[PDB]
Structure formats: structure tokens, C-alpha cells
Amino acid sequence: KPVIWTVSVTRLFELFRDISLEFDHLANITPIQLGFEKAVTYIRKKLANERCDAIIAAGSNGAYLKSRLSVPVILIKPSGYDVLQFLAKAGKLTSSIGVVTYQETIPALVAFQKTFNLRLDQRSYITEEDARGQINELKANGTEAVVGAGLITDLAEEAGMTGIFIYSAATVRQAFSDALDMTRMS
Amino acid sequence: KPVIWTVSVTRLFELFRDISLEFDHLANITPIQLGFEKAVTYIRKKLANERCDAIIAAGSNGAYLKSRLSVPVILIKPSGYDVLQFLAKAGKLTSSIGVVTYQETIPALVAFQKTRLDQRSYITEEDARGQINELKANGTEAVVGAGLITDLAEEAGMTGIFIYSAATVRQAFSDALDMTRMSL
Numbered sequence: 236k237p238v239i240w241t242v243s244v245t246r247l248f249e250l251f252r253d254i255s256l257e258f259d260h261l262a263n264i265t266p267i268q269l270g271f272e273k274a275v276t277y278i279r280k281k282l283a284n285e286r287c288d289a290i291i292a293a294g295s296n297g298a299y300l301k302s303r304l305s306v307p308v309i310l311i312k313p314s315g316y317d318v319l320q321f322l323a324k325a326g327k328l329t330s331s332i333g334v335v336t337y338q339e340t341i342p343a344l345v346a347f348q349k350t351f352n353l354r355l356d357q358r359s360y361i362t363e364e365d366a367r368g369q370i371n372e373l374k375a376n377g378t379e380a381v382v383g384a385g386l387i388t389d390l391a392e393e394a395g396m397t398g399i400f401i402y403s404a405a406t407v408r409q410a411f412s413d414a415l416d417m418t419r420m421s
Numbered sequence: 422k423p424v425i426w427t428v429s430v431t432r433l434f435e436l437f438r439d440i441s442l443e444f445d446h447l448a449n450i451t452p453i454q455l456g457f458e459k460a461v462t463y464i465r466k467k468l469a470n471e472r473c474d475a476i477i478a479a480g481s482n483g484a485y486l487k488s489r490l491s492v493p494v495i496l497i498k499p500s501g502y503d504v505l506q507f508l509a510k511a512g513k514l515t516s517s518i519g520v521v522t523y524q525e526t527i528p529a530l531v532a533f534q535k536t537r538l539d540q541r542s543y544i545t546e547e548d549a550r551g552q553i554n555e556l557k558a559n560g561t562e563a564v565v566g567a568g569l570i571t572d573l574a575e576e577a578g579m580t581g582i583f584i585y586s587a588a589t590v591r592q593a594f595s596d597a598l599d600m601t602r603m604s605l
Contacts, residue, residue, distance in 0.1 A: 289603075307603035307604075308603075309603075314592075315502070316500060316501075316502040316529075319502065319533075320501075320529050320532065323532040323533050323535070323536045324532050326536070328533075328536045329536060343502065343588070346506070347502070347505075347506070350505075350506060350509045351505075351509070413596075413600065416600070417600050417603050417604050420475070420493045420600065420601070420604035421604050421605075
């Protein structure tokens with residue numbers, strides 16, 4: 236069976252665990268709960284003794300791993316199209332939604348907001364202080380739900396809004412399937 | 422550096438051509454303007470003399486190649502996001518709309534229209550003409566689909582709206598080259 240190591244923390248780690256149960260019969264999956272240099276060091280030391288066919292990771296962590304490992308890294312990056320799907324499924328697409336993302340907004344989401352005159356208030360952040368202020372601003376304008384990664388979803392919940400984790404089950408499931416497909420291609 | 426063959430005709434071919442220009446430093450891309458039996462026959466001959474790492478294709482033709490060939494075939498799926506955006510672009514959001522895709526309906530669209538749209542599927546060309554004819558008979562004004570459905574809709578006297586956008590094709594090319602590169 237293909238060997239897959241997932242690298243994640245917190246909510247994403249929880250989601251990866253949930254979804255990997257669907258692929259246990261197709262892959263030998265080992266969860267790694269690290270990031271960045273510590274993950275690189277662990278993975279490189281692990282690779283001295285055992286093979287790995289693919290790593291699955293997300294965001295800034297996964298982008299860093301992808302440029303530093305010669306093992307294939309399937310990088311999860313949320314699209315506006317998956318966000319819109321998660322929203323519309325939950326019937327929240329026509330509600331007061333906030334989206335706060337690291338470094339930049341999502342152009343597919345910015346565009347859909349443009350065309351459909353929806354209430355999707357899209358913001359970016361770099362630091363925790365940045366993220367806190369964007370959350371406080373969304374709270375203060377009646378926003379009911381905020382889409383983002385771990386820090387943003389947590390902050391949103393503490394602020395009394397719905398936190399919608401930007402990585403859906405569907406996008407994680409796709410990443411497992413892509414790792415299997417890639418492995419099959421070799 | 423991946424060796425990629427793109428296989429498409431007419432409208433999709435034009436899109437693939439434009440998008441390949443953005444990827445030419447990242448893969449060696451060869452366009453093949455063929456479909457179905459003719460495509461498989463030629464591709465099989467070409468494979469006997471040249472390396473191919475993956476094929477990029479779509480819809481009915483893409484499925485025909487994938488079932489016939491021992492080279493990886495990467496399929497671009499139609500997006501419910503493209504359906505909505507190109508409907509908006511055509512000025513058809515409040516028109517009587519049909520959507521016809523190969524084999525399967527677009528599962529994402531069921532939630533979006535729940536948030537005047539008749540979603541159909543086809544397998545064969547006769548199926549396709551059948552759906553187009555039923556759509557015309559129901560007072561449908563515009564039909565979103567790929568190359569065949571778009572041609573048929575237009576020939577039937579409806580507005581044909583091509584289901585693929587530059588943006589979706591660009592992303593699919595990016596992911597396919599990544600997968601192929603990882604695969605090597």
C-alpha cells in the first residue's frame with residue numbers, strides 16, 4: 236500500500252485523522268504533529284529508515300515543507316469554490332459571512348462576491364494582533380460566521396460568531412485521492 | 422521536466438493553447454487536436470516513438486482516452502463556479518437555463534441553485550441531441566456545457582455558453598504539472 240505521512244496541528248490534525256479513516260484500507264497513513272523546521276528534521280530522520288510515497292500538508296507549513304523535501308508534498312490550498320460550497324451547503328451563503336485569510340484574500344471569492352452582491356466580507360492578516368483586530372471589526376459589524384484557518388476559527392468562536400474551518404472534509408479527501416493517484420502514476 | 426500532451430478540439434483546444442503559453446517553461450507541451458477513436462489511434466502510434474508523462478483532457482473525449490490508454494490521463498472537471506460566473510457574464514442568471522454535462526450532473530450546483538436551472542447529463546452524441554431537443558421543447562433559453570453541447574444549443578436556436586473558463590483551465594494545468602512532476 237502507498238505510504239502517506241500527514242503533517243498538521245490542532246483543527247487540521249483533527250480533520251486529517253477523521254478523513255484518513257476513509258483511506259486506511261488504501262494507504263498506510265502516519266500522522267505527524269509538527270511543522271516547519273522541526274517537521275523537516277523529524278521527516279528527514281524518519282526517511283533514513285523507512286520509505287514515504289507522499290506527504291500531505293496545508294498552508295504556510297506545507298509550502299515550507301514542499302520546497303525542502305524531495306518526497307512529494309500534496310499541498311492543500313482552499314479555493315473560493317470549496318468555501319462557497321461549504322457555505323451554500325450550510326445555507327449560510329446568503330448570510331453575513333466574514334473571511335479572514337493569511338497574507339492575501341482569495342480572488343475567486345473576491346470575484347464571486349463582486350458578481351453576486353453577497354455579504355462576504357473578505358480580509359487578510361499577518362500577525363495574531365492583526366487577526367484579533369479583523370475579528371473585532373467583523374464582530375462589531377454584525378458578522379455571524381467567519382471562514383479561516385485555525386487561529387481565525389478559534390478567535391471567531393471566542394468572539395461569539397460561528398467559526399467555519401477553511402479546510403473542508405471534501406478538500407482533505409481530494410488530497411488523499413491526489414496522493415494515491417500520483418503514487419499510481421509512478 | 423514533464424512531457425505533457427493536451428488532447429482537445431475547437432473551443433477547449435483554443436483555451437488549452439492560451440493556457441499552455443503560461444506553462445511552457447515548466448513542461449514540454451504538445452497539443453493534439455483529435456478526439457475519440459482517431460485520437461487513440463494516433464496517440465498509440467506517437468507513444469511508440471516518443472515519451473509522454475501525462476495527457477490532459479476533458480469530458481467525453483477525456484474519459485474515452487483514459488479507458489483506452491496506458492499513459493496517465495488527467496481530466497478537467499466542469500465547475501459549478503464556472504456555471505454561475507459564465508451565466509452571470511452572459512446576462513442569463515434570470516433566464517430559463519439548462520446545464521448538460523458528460524455522464525454526471527455537477528453535484529455542487531444543487532446547493533447553489535437552492536441558494537431556473539435544468540441539470541442533465543449525456544453519454545453519447547444521440548443522448549446529447551436528445552437532451553438539447555428536450556431543453557428546446559421546454560422553453561429553455563441558454564444551455565451551459567462543453568464544446569458539443571454548446572454547438573448543439575446554438576444550432577438549436579438557443580444561447581450556448583461554454584462551461585470552462587481560463588481560470589479553471591489555468592488551475593487544472595498547474596495542478597496537473599505538479600502531480601506529473603511529483604510523479605517523476
